[PDB]
């Protein structure tokens, strides 16, 4: 039956994957021959051929991406991969993909993103490390032939097993189409206390929530879990149906009707948390609050807390919770791959990034809807407003006022001369101990460096990861460089006084902001009076 053809191909050279997988211009894929074929083939050729018959791959996506899945099954089948697991209609969120790779003990998975992206995840359910990403790139630059089952067609709409007899192959090629939500919900159903949540969302004094899935993959998960299972009225979920916004959710919550709001992105499994009247829980505080109230979640009560982590530019709010506890705190470079290594070593339970990422060692990717159920679990046992919880937290731990300035499309030349001169400043033996002033506030440099991180799981040494100016009072200024160049400025000002814990943060952060711009001389090098985005 199903025939297997070998296609001669010309290898492409712009095919270096990246941390979130290969993301190139959609126009590049349609205007290039086999561009996707050689990459799906390169990914598959990383698996030793003896292992391909016992191997299963999980495929993720939104559901245009249906035809990328077809191309992936025709090359996986023809390469002797034994089985694929695909969500119904091509829909599987990557938190659900990670969950499934780990439960069924798969060799990894391929996740398709919309700009169109292709990402390969390995056996622990997390993104492929720099070795595996390099190997795909190495093979990709030299792939001269790829195999395909030209005539094979998967029915992505019918649940269950579909089998394919391959020519000159004895065992069949197997595709299993799974319900998009079942496995993910079942894992969540044991992490969390669903009866306590059903109660929090239905009935007498039910908590009123508003959830914006932003037309992404998490959409249907919201309808199955928060509405159908947990009982939230269906008006709680907007845009929960992927279709080929945070500001529109803040406006809604400024109306004051809802107790809790959240937004889920597309894309990169991020989450935004809000309280009544649009009170903003910033992501650095959010991980800290979960940390301080962690034992409301059945999962952590039963598995313990093996460690806390945050990326380096995240605020130190989470440190204040950890310093009080005998649990270690790890400070990682930006990116989520480092979190995964410490979870594989059983040293990390809860982690987060200022860039709206929150997670736990339940899987090996961020989980935006997981963070919402973590928040609602806390609201169920604390029985206070989201804002009253934050004020109680701040008054207990002090407040880490935090903001991120984004300078987009800065002049690369200036941007390099920006960092280079500033870093050269921070080596003069005088620097440490200097004092910066205005307005009658004083900050004293305690440490200053360019963040380096040695991975304890793999021995990667990640250098030049951000300039850090650390002050004796616990405040910090961090500079990072991320077509056109983006400069990121992070400001973290610690405040212990209750008379100061509840003022507007742009007001409280202005002195460090002014200090940051002077030391950096950013305006003179960027040519910029203000930043492009303030968060």
Kind of pairing between the strands at 83-87 and 173-178: parallel
**93 contacts 119 by C-beta, under 8 angstroms:** no
Query: Cα(513)–Cα(498) distance, rounded to whole angstroms?
Result: 22
Domains and CATH numbers, the chain: 1-187 (3.40.120.10), 188-278 (3.40.120.10), 279-378 (3.40.120.10), 379-526 (3.30.310.50)
Q: How far is CA 356 from CA 76, 221, 265, 513, in A?
A: 34, 19, 10, 22
Write the residues followed by a gap in the chain (C–N more than 2.5 A). Answer: 63, 114, 244, 482
**532 contacts 410 by C-beta, under 8 angstroms:** no
Q: Is 254 helix (H, G, I), strand (E, B) or coil?
A: helix
Q: How many CB atoms lie within 10 A of CB 54?
A: 10
Q: Is 150 exposed, middle or buried (0-12, 13-18, 19+ CB in 10 A)?
A: exposed
Query: Cα(225)–Cα(163) distance, rounded to whole angstroms?
Result: 31
H-helix or E-strand spanning residue 410: strand 399-410
Identify which of 403, 421, 402, 415 has the alpha carbon closest to the alpha carbon of residue 486: 415
What would the DSSP string read from start to end of 211-275? Answer: EE-TTSTHHHHIIIIIIIIT---GGGEES-S----HHHHHHHHHTS--SEEEEE-SSS--EEEEE
- Hunting for tokens 């697991």 — which residue is that? 85
Task: Let me know the angle formed at the C-alpha of 12 by 93 and 84, rounded to the nearest 5 degrees.
Answer: 35
Identify which of 246, 71, 102 has the alpha carbon closest to the alpha carbon of residue 183: 102
Query: Cα(242)–Cα(70) distance, rounded to whole angstroms?
Result: 20
Kind of pairing between the strands at 56-60 and 173-178: unpaired
Query: Cα(284)–Cα(266) distance, rounded to whole angstroms?
Result: 21
Identify which of 407, 530, 533, 535 has the alpha carbon closest to the alpha carbon of residue 480: 407
Identify which of 214, 224, 486, 218 has the alpha carbon closest to the alpha carbon of residue 366: 218
Give Cα 102 to chain centroid, integer Å.
18
Binding residues for alpha-D-glucose 1,6-bisphosphate are: 23, 269-270, 334, 353, 355, 366
Q: How many CB atoms lie within 10 A of CB 431?
A: 14
Kind of pairing between the strands at 442-450 and 435-437: antiparallel
Identify which of 503, 535, 496, 530 has the alpha carbon closest to the alpha carbon of residue 514: 530
**484 contacts 414 by C-beta, under 8 angstroms:** no
**431 contacts 404 by C-beta, under 8 angstroms:** no
Residues 6+ apart with CB under 8 A from 533: 404, 405, 406, 408
Q: How many CB atoms lie within 10 A of CB 317?
A: 31
Q: How many CB atoms lie within 10 A of CB 205?
A: 9
**212 contacts 241 by C-beta, under 8 angstroms:** no
Query: Cα(118)–Cα(122) distance, rounded to whole angstroms?
Result: 14
Name the phi and psi angles at 238, rounded to 5. Answer: -110, 145
- 153-185 burial: b if 16+ Cβ within 10 Å, else e: ebebeeeeebebebeebeebbbbbbbebbebbb
Binding residues for Mg(2+) are: 265, 267, 269
Query: Cα(453)–Cα(21) distance, rounded to whole angstroms?
Result: 22
Give Cα 392 to chain centroid, integer Å.
28
Identify which of 174, 1, 154, 10 has the alpha carbon closest to the alpha carbon of residue 90: 154
Q: Most distant CA pair in the chain: distance in Å?
A: 81
Query: Cα(90)–Cα(97) distance, rounded to whole angstroms?
Result: 12
Q: How far is CA 136 from CA 13, 22, 95, 133, 408, in A?
A: 12, 10, 23, 5, 30
Q: How far is CA 412 from CA 163, 409, 416, 485, 488, in A?
A: 53, 8, 6, 6, 13
Binding residues are: 23, 265, 267, 269-270, 334, 353, 355, 366
Query: Cα(245)–Cα(500) distance, rounded to whole angstroms?
Result: 32
Query: Cα(97)–Cα(118) distance, rounded to whole angstroms?
Result: 14
What would the DSSP string read from start to end of 203-227? Answer: STTPPPEEEE-TTSTHHHHIIIIII
Query: Cα(45)–Cα(195) distance, rounded to whole angstroms?
Result: 46
What would the DSSP string read from start to end of 347-404? Answer: --SEEEETTTEEEETTSSS--HHHHHHHHHHHHHHH-S-HHHHHHHHHHHH-EEEEEE
**172 contacts 6 by C-beta, under 8 angstroms:** no
Name the phi and psi angles at 100, rounded to 5. Answer: -75, -45
Q: Is 147 helix (H, G, I), strand (E, B) or coil?
A: strand
Query: Cα(81)–Cα(127) distance, rounded to whole angstroms?
Result: 20
Q: Is 168 helix (H, G, I), strand (E, B) or coil?
A: coil
Name the phi and psi angles at 534, rounded to 5. Answer: -120, 130
Q: Taking the CA atoms of the chain, what radius of gyration do you get in angstroms?
A: 24
Q: Is the peptide bond before 267 cis (omega within 30 degrees of 0)?
A: yes
What would the DSSP string read from start to end of 431-479? Answer: STT-EEESSS-EEEEEEEEE--EE-TTT--EE----EEEEETTS-EEEE
């Amino acid at each position: 039956m199903v025939k297997i053809v070998t296609v001669k191909t010309q290898a492409y050279q712009d095919q270096k994957p990246g941390t979130s997988g290969l993301r190139k211009r959609v126009k590049v894929f349609q205007s290039s021959a086999n561009y996707a074929e050689n990459f799906i083939q390169s990914i598959i050729s990383t698996v030793e051929p003896a292992q391909r018959q016992e191997a299963t791959l999980v495929v993720g996506g939104d559901g245009y991406m249906k035809e990328a899945i077809q191309l992936i099954a025709r090359i996986a089948a023809a390469n002797g991969i034994g089985r694929l697991v695909i969500g119904q209609n091509g829909i599987l969120s990557t938190p659900a993909v990670s969950c499934i790779i780990r439960k069924i003990k798969a060799i990894g998975g391929i996740i398709l993103t919309a700009d169109f992206g292709i990402k390969f995840n390995i056996s622990n359910g997390g993104p492929a490390p720099e070795a595996i990403t390099d190997k795909i790139f190495q093979i990709s630059k030299t792939i001269e032939e790829y195999a395909v089952c030209p005539d094979l067609k998967v029915d992505l709409g019918v649940l269950g097993k579909q089998q394919f007899d391959l020519e000159n192959k004895f065992k069949p090629f197997t595709v299993e189409i799974v319900d998009s939500v079942e496995a993910y919900a079942t894992m969540l159903r044991s992490i969390f206390d669903f009866s306590a949540l059903k109660e929090l969302l239905s009935g007498p004094n039910r908590l009123k929530i508003r959830i914006d899935a932003m037309h992404g993959v998490v959409g249907p998960y919201v309808k199955k879990i928060l509405c159908e299972e947990l009982g939230a009225p269906a008006n709680s979920a907007v845009n929960c149906v992927p279709l080929e916004y945070a500001a529109d959710l803040v406006e809604t919550m400024k109306s004051g009707e809802h107790d809790f709001g959240a937004a889920f992105d597309g894309d990169r499994d991020r989450n935004m948390i809000l309280g009544k009247h649009g009170f903003f829980v910033n992501p650095s505080d959010s991980v800290a609050v979960i940390a301080a109230n962690i034992f409301s979640i059945p999962y952590f009560q039963q598995t313990g807390v093996r460690g806390f982590a945050r990326s380096m530019p995240t605020s130190g709010a989470l440190d204040r919770v950890a310093s009080a506890t005998k649990i270690a705190l790890y400070e990682t470079p930006t990116g989520w791959k480092f979190f995964g290594n410490l979870m594989d070593a059983s040293k990390l339970s809860l982690c987060g990034e200022e860039s709206f990422g929150t997670g736990s060692d339940h899987i090996r990717e961020k989980d935006g809807l997981w963070a919402v159920l973590a928040w609602l679990s806390i609201l169920a046992t604390r029985k206070q407003s989201v804002e009253d919880i934050l004020k109680d937290h701040w008054q207990k731990y002090g407040r880490n006022f935090f903001t991120r300035y984004d300078y987009e499309e800065v002049e690369a030349e200036g941007a390099n001369k920006m960092m280079k001169d500033l870093e050269a400043l921070m080596f003069d033996r005088s620097f440490v101990g200097k004092q910066f002033s205005a307005n009658d506030k004083v900050y004293t440099v305690e440490k200053a460096d360019n963040f380096e991180y040695s991975d304890p799981v793999d021995g990667s040494i990640s250098r030049n990861q951000g300039l850090r100016l650390i002050f004796t009072d616990g405040s910090r200024i961090v500079f990072r460089l991320s077509a056109g160049a983006t400069i990121r400025l992070y400001i973290d000002s610690y405040e212990k006084d209750v008379a100061k814990i509840n003022q507007d943060p742009q007001v409280m952060l202005a002195p460090l902001i002014s200090i940051a711009l002077k030391v950096s001389q950013l305006q003179e090098r960027t040519g910029r009076t203000a930043p492009t985005v303030i968060t």
